[PDB]
From a paper:
Here, we present a workflow that utilizes the SPT Labtech chameleon – a next-generation nanospray cryoEM grid preparation device – in an aerobic environment to freeze O2-sensitive proteins under functionally anaerobic conditions, which we term (an)aerobic. Demonstrating the utility of this workflow, we determined high-resolution cryoEM structures of deoxygenated human hemoglobin (Hb) in various liganded states and the molybdenum-iron protein (MoFeP) – the O2-sensitive catalytic component of Azotobacter vinelandii nitrogenase – in a reduced state. Our workflow maintains (an)aerobic samples by protecting against or eliminating O2 contamination prior to loading into the chameleon, during sample aspiration, and throughout sample deposition on self-wicking EM grids, respectively. Finally, we detail the effects of O2 contamination at different stages of the workflow and show how to prevent their effects. Together, we demonstrate reproducible high-resolution structure determination of O2-sensitive proteins of varying complexity and size – as small as 64 kDa – with a workflow requiring only minimal modifications to a robust, widely available EM grid freezing method.
We chose an O2-binding protein, human hemoglobin (Hb), as a model system for development of an (an)aerobic workflow for sample preparation in the chameleon. To begin to explore the relationship between [NaDT] and wicking time, we first prepared deoxyHb in PBS buffer supplemented with 25 µM NaDT (here termed “very low NaDT”). Although this concentration of NaDT is an order of magnitude below the predicted concentration of O2 (250 µM) in solutions prepared under an ambient atmosphere, we included it to ensure that all hemes remained in the ferrous state after initial preparation of deoxyHb and buffer exchange. We then transferred the deoxyHb sample from the anaerobic environment to the chameleon using the protective oil layer conditions described above and prepared EM grids using similar conditions and wicking times as our metHb samples. We then determined the structure of this “very low NaDT” Hb at a resolution of 2.55-Å. This structure revealed that Hb was in the relaxed (R) conformation (as indicated by the rotation of α1β1 in relation to the α2β2), which is the form of Hb with a high affinity of O2.36 Evaluation of the heme pocket for each subunit indicated a density above each heme that was not present in our metHb structures, consistent with molecular O2 binding to the Fe centers. The O2-heme coordination metrics and geometries closely correspond to those observed in the X-ray structures of oxyHb.48 In addition, we used Phenix.resolve_cryo_em – a cryoEM density modification tool adapted from X-ray crystallography – to better visualize the O2 density above the hemes. This dataset demonstrated that during sample deposition and self-wicking, O2 exchanges rapidly enough for Hb to bind it. A 2.55-Å resolution cryoEM structure of oxyHb determined under 25 µM NaDT.
Author numbering:
A (entry chain B), C (entry chain D): 2 to 146
B (entry chain A), D (entry chain C): 2 to 140
Write the structure that this text describes.
């Protein structure tokens, strides 16, 4: 549940997000920091070193898709459960991804946003984005509930 | 904690330098804003923005982290008193340490772009988890 | 969701559960094994040693209450969310209990049932009871979702 | 851990004796039944009730736990090859180690009532968590 000011701040910061690199950066950092998540991405080629992970075009292409899904969720903050129904089905029934990894990826994305925006990523903006990523993770984990 | 992790952590926290207290206060503020349930551990604290109590607590936490970095191979012995506090007297829920570690990582990312590479991020995450499990090891 | 076989097994085992000591044993073991949970029960008196915890009349009475709530949830397996609405409000918006402790207490209760029933607590019965305790914990943590 | 934890764990696991393989197989069966998502790590395994593959894997896990008990103060060095396996090749999610530890605790409770006191339960929980974090150390 975001207040109108939190929503305005979130949508103002998201408008300046590079949609071609932020998702790839978040996915690569997830793979580097929690390398058991690499088990889900063996078909992505070389993942042995952090440089190879962040240089992987498949990781960049997938991160772009994940960032697009996050943008879709951000455009539907009041219908997150219905927005992520098919993605929840895919991630739970088909891929067997533990729901703690959703929270991990959301926190990695928060860290990536902080890294890119620096001082303008204020604590109130981060709190609103934590609300957003918690909602997204909860919506994606619904099929386990 | 591999030796590579220790090497990465020492340089990254060395470039923190004299901004450690400010970074700790900012991480505490971020934790209080993002996770208000953590505020229940500080009922006697003035927890508004710019609070001198929060500033002093951030300096203390930053100094503890600096000592932990200086004693990375002997952290359980170096943090015995803090573990005693946090586990016996405070008995803080271990999820709060994950929350504070995440806020510290966010502060470091927002203040040190060049230093916050993915490998340094992984090393800092592992170091903060080790510090957290040392501080909860007395349970 | 439980199959009719799982429901029958769970009901048959729960009919033999001693409602005066099982909840107290579960609460005491939760306090001993996860001593940070003692922060929520500082008005119960002496909790300094495991024997003092297991001999605490306040802990025994509160465990009786918790076991009664578990029986209430077991009598309504398709409406756990509505069965635990007020308890969820109390535990989240009033007590600020982190939802991981709900799963911890459910697993402690499973261990207590295994301890009491021995070979009767077969792996299928345990799987059904894990489903039950997961549902109860999810229903109790609804206010955080 | 603590000296008391080590003593309790040593006594409890000594009381396991020659039923270690049976207890490990039963814990594996309990984990597969209660948490079917753990089955994805064994796609080449016959995972039905009474399976000889599950029996052998349970014997191996029990022997590893016995070695860890015998080397409780040097567990990270004693379990280096197993941690290498589980972290590099297998890449097991850490949540799965919590699930297996819970199933081991359930098996121990259902087979050793007198030994499974609250203090022994706490010590076994701590020991299994230490084994799990050693086996996930390489990440
Ligand atoms: C937390 C928020 C997440 C979002 C919004 C998200 C989004 C997506 C999207 C949009 C797709 C592509 C679906 C399609 O093309 O039809 C996808 C697939 C996938 N996701 Fe995620 N994801 C998340 C978390 C995760 C995590 C944490 C993991 C693993 C640890 C993961 C593993 C995968 C995999 C392996 C695929 C490939 C599925 C396939 O190729 O069929 N996801 N996800
Ligand atoms: C890396 C993690 C942490 C470090 C390094 C740390 C360090 C410290 C230090 C140095 C002190 C002061 C000790 C003294 O003055 O003698 C302290 C006190 C305290 N800490 Fe932490 N801490 C951490 C995590 C946490 C978390 C996550 C919480 C709660 C959510 C917490 C709650 C407290 C409280 C309530 C006090 C007492 C403050 C007072 O009474 O004035 N700590 N900690
Ligand atoms: C997981 C399943 C749980 C169930 C079914 C349950 C059930 C209950 C019940 C029936 C009450 C009494 C409410 C009343 O008398 O009005 C209660 C209160 C309480 N619960 Fe729980 N509980 C659970 C978990 C927990 C956990 C894990 C903790 C702490 C770590 C906790 C802390 C408390 C406390 C401190 C109270 C007393 C507060 C008050 O009465 O105002 N509960 N719970
Ligand atoms: C209590 C902690 C655990 C211990 C002590 C343990 C011990 C072992 C041992 C001794 C082996 C055999 C290695 C060899 O042949 O030399 C093994 C293999 C394996 N373990 Fe574990 N393990 C543990 C937890 C887990 C968990 C939680 C999973 C995942 C659900 C897992 C999945 C595997 C797999 C997939 C293999 C390879 C099986 C094969 O190909 O034969 N282990 N483990």
């Amino acid at each position: 549940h975001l207040t109108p000011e939190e929503k305005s701040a979130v949508t103002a910061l998201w408008g300046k997000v590079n949609v071609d690199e932020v998702g790839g950066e978040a996915l690569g950092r997830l793979l580097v920091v929690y390398p058991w998540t690499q088990r889900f991405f063996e078909s992505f080629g070389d993942l042995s070193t952090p440089d190879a992970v962040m240089g992987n075009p498949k990781v960049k292409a997938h991160g772009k898709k994940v960032l697009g899904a996050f943008s879709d969720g951000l455009a539907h903050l009041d219908n997150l459960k219905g927005t992520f129904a098919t993605l929840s089905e895919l991630h739970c029934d088909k891929l067997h991804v533990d729901p703690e990894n959703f929270r991990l990826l959301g926190n990695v994305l928060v860290c990536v946003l902080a890294h890119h925006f620096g001082k303008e990523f204020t604590p109130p903006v981060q709190a609103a984005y934590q609300k957003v990523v918690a909602g997204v993770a909860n919506a994606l984990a619904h099929k386990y509930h | 904690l591999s030796p590579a992790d220790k090497t990465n952590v020492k340089a990254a926290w060395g470039k923190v330098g004299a901004h450690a207290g400010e970074y700790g206060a900012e991480a505490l503020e971020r934790m209080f804003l993002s996770f208000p349930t953590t505020k229940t551990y500080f009922p006697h604290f003035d927890l508004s923005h710019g609070s001198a109590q929060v500033k002093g607590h951030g300096k203390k936490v930053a100094d503890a982290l600096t000592n932990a970095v200086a004693h990375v191979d002997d952290m359980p012995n170096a943090l015995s008193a803090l573990s005693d506090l946090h586990a016996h007297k405070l008995r803080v829920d271990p999820v709060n340490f994950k929350l504070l570690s995440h806020c510290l990582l966010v502060t470091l990312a927002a203040h040190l772009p060049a230093e916050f590479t993915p490998a340094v991020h992984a090393s800092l995450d592992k170091f903060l988890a080790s510090v957290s499990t040392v501080l909860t090891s007395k349970y």
